[PDB]
């Protein structure tokens, strides 16, 4: 599953291509700013406030 | 018509259509070359050269 070059393009065609899928188009994370911590101040723990 | 097997590959042991060898034989070094090289990255990546080659 993470070296896609162990599936075979011939024995298993399809298996493979939606591996290579997967890898390519699964969502890619982000974020946004929320708050106002000069007022709330911020109960983040392990990200920036 | 026939090739003869050395060290590795002697253990082609299961069912003839489990491993999905090509009909001609230059057709089949291609194919036995590649899949060769795949899995000796494979090895390499536990036992780094620089360390386990002797």
């Given at each position: 599953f993470m070296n896609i070059q162990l599936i075979s393009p011939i024995d298993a065609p399809i298996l493979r291509q939606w591996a290579e899928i997967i890898h390519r188009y699964w969502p890619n994370p982000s974020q946004i700013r929320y708050g106002?911590?000069?007022?709330?101040g911020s109960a983040n723990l392990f990200t920036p406030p | 018509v026939a090739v003869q097997l050395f060290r590795p590959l002697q253990g082609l042991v299961l069912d003839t259509q489990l491993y999905g060898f090509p009909g001609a034989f230059d057709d089949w070094e291609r194919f036995m070359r590649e899949k060769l090289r795949v899995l000796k990255y494979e090895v390499l990546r536990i036992y780094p050269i620089s360390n386990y080659s002797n």
């Amino acid at each position: 599953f993470m070296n896609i070059q162990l599936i075979s393009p011939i024995d298993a065609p399809i298996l493979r291509q939606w591996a290579e899928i997967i890898h390519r188009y699964w969502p890619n994370p982000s974020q946004i700013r929320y708050g106002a911590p000069n007022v709330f101040g911020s109960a983040n723990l392990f990200t920036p406030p | 018509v026939a090739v003869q097997l050395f060290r590795p590959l002697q253990g082609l042991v299961l069912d003839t259509q489990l491993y999905g060898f090509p009909g001609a034989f230059d057709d089949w070094e291609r194919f036995m070359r590649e899949k060769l090289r795949v899995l000796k990255y494979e090895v390499l990546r536990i036992y780094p050269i620089s360390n386990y080659s002797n």
